[PDB]
């Protein structure tokens, strides 16, 4: 029922496709002249007409426009083989087998989700549903946090951050689904698996919400101050060797995430971690301690085992609608095995991301949609793809300071232009747009 776009949202997308690049330029120039000549044309009529009455062809370009002059700018640049900030182009050369990627922390920024609360009814609807479910288990308001009201808790607090990023990531998924982009599989990084399970339907919304709320609250109580996570731009095995120096006679530092060929996360007590980061900042290596992070995925969580199994005894896992590529046990779960023990293992075992990306590649997944507010895993996935000679698209949803329909439609165009089927017609729903006559070029 809820639409991609508020009926008064000025942003709309114009999808175009030709046989070859010259046909795409010619139709764009014709379309520009069609618009220039008639000041009375509805941008929604033309959009609906492009999205409904045009052949789907290999060479693709989407113009994201909120006005005539943004449409003439886009179609002008398109027409003279020139780039532009609001034109996304590509060849439909991918199979479009899609995996939705739910990271943990690092996606967050102040203002995330706001522009879409005000401008996307689908996003708003899903955000209300999911927020509604988390607010059974907390006293604060998810919308109020996201909108940055005076009274609202701080995102610096792991126990506010996790439930919020969960709402945002799960709500972004439903916006893709309304655009016609459904996952054929789902992957999650630590707390991202809680979102993937909600999006897969393996956990009820209510059960998923309660897990991220109770586990992040348990970490705020037991683990804040006693340890953190650091990111290091070395292969994991190289970092394992360096870690051995510290934590000689006990696990003070442990690998927390094999994220990439040259990207690993380490967890443990703050001092050992800061010593490791400085020793490595010396030898040119990109290593930093992530803020608002506890030393999960380490021995520090072993003592909370009995408390976590009781806290999450309520979870009734069930078979989901798509497979979850576990980054805990490296299996292809159907979701019915995501009980209390899984959610302990999810918070204890080092995140095995790098190998499930390779496994996904081999299984023929060639489109990676990160259902997040800023891309934390997509560049890693691209770097892995090129090191392996694979053609994939790793596509983020929103970015820092770009969190509205213009950004969504650009990300939606990233995936359409590379051969994912998209319901562009849905951009115009509820507007009473009509199909109108379009210039034909070399065809139609």
């Amino acid at each position: 029922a809820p639409a991609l776009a508020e009926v008064l949202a000025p942003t709309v997308p114009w999808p175009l496709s030709g046989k070859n690049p010259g046909a795409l330029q010619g139709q764009a120039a014709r379309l520009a002249a069609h618009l220039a000549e008639d000041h009375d044309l509805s941008l929604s009529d033309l959009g609906l007409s492009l999205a409904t009455t045009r052949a789907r062809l290999e060479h693709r370009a989407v113009v994201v426009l909120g006005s005539r002059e943004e449409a003439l700018g886009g179609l002008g640049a398109l027409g003279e083989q020139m780039p532009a900030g609001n034109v996304v182009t590509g060849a439909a050369d991918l199979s479009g087998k899609t995996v939705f990627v739910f990271p943990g922390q690092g996606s967050q920024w102040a203002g995330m989700a706001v522009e879409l609360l005000d401008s996307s009814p689908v996003f708003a609807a899903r955000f209300a549903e999911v927020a509604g479910a988390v607010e059974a288990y907390v006293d604060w308001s998810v919308e109020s946090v996201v909108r940055g009201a005076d009274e609202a808790p701080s995102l610096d607090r792991i126990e506010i951050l996790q439930p919020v990023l969960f709402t945002v990531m799960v709500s972004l998924a439903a916006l893709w689904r309304a655009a016609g982009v459904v996952p054929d599989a789902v992957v999650g990084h630590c707390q991202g698996e809680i979102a993937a399970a909600a999006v897969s339907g393996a956990l009820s919304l209510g059960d998923a919400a309660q897990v991220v709320v109770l586990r992040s609250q348990l970490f705020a109580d037991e683990l804040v101050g006693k340890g953190a996570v650091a990111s290091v731009s070395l292969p994991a095995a190289e970092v394992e060797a360096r870690i051995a120096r510290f934590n000689g006679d006990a696990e003070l530092l442990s690998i927390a995430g094999n994220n990439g060929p040259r990207s690993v996360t380490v967890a443990g007590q703050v001092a050992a971690l800061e010593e490791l980061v400085a020793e490595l900042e010396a030898e040119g290596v990109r290593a930093k301690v992530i803020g608002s992070t506890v030393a999960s995925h380490s021995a520090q969580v072993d003592p909370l085992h009995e408390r976590i199994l009781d806290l999450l005894s309520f979870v009734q896992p069930r078979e989901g609608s798509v497979p979850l590529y576990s980054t805990v046990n490296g299996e292809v779960l159907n979701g019915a095995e995501l009980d209390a023990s899984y959610w302990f293992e999810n918070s204890r075992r080092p995140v095995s991301f790098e190998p499930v990306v390779r496994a996904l590649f081999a299984d023929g997944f060639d489109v990676f949609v990160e259902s997040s507010a800023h891309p934390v895993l997509t560049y890693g996935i691209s770097e892995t793809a090129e090191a392996a000679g694979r053609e994939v698209l790793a596509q983020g949803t929103l970015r820092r300071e770009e969190g509205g329909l213009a950004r969504f439609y650009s990300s939606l165009a990233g995936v359409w232009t590379r051969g994912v089927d998209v319901d562009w017609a849905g951009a115009f729903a509820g507007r009473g747009a009509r199909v109108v006559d379009l210039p034909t070029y070399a065809f139609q």
């Binding site: 020139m82 780039p83 532009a84 900030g85 800023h374 970015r399």
Partner: protein
């Protein structure tokens, strides 16, 4: 650019970095970017920094540090470092 003066090098590398930044920004003018303006002010997150580095690596046919954009804040500074790099 061996048959080119130092000032000519400065100018070609500055035209390269400004063109590549404009492509990442999407303006695509290639002259819109101000050489003095810092990348932060232009609208640069960490992701835009590594995209600029990828494009400059491609164009110069060299492998550059991921932090090179952060380390040399303006196009002029990055152009000047690239004289040392190539």
């Amino acid at each position: 650019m061996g048959a080119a003066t130092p000032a000519e090098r400065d100018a070609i590398l500055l035209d390269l970095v400004r063109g590549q930044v404009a492509a990442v920004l999407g303006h695509a003018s290639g002259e819109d970017i101000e050489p003095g303006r810092a990348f932060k002010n232009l609208g640069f997150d960490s992701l835009t920094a590594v995209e600029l580095r990828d494009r400059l690596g491609a164009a110069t046919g060299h492998k550059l540090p991921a932090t090179i954009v952060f380390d040399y804040p303006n196009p002029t500074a990055l152009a000047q470092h690239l004289r040392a790099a190539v």
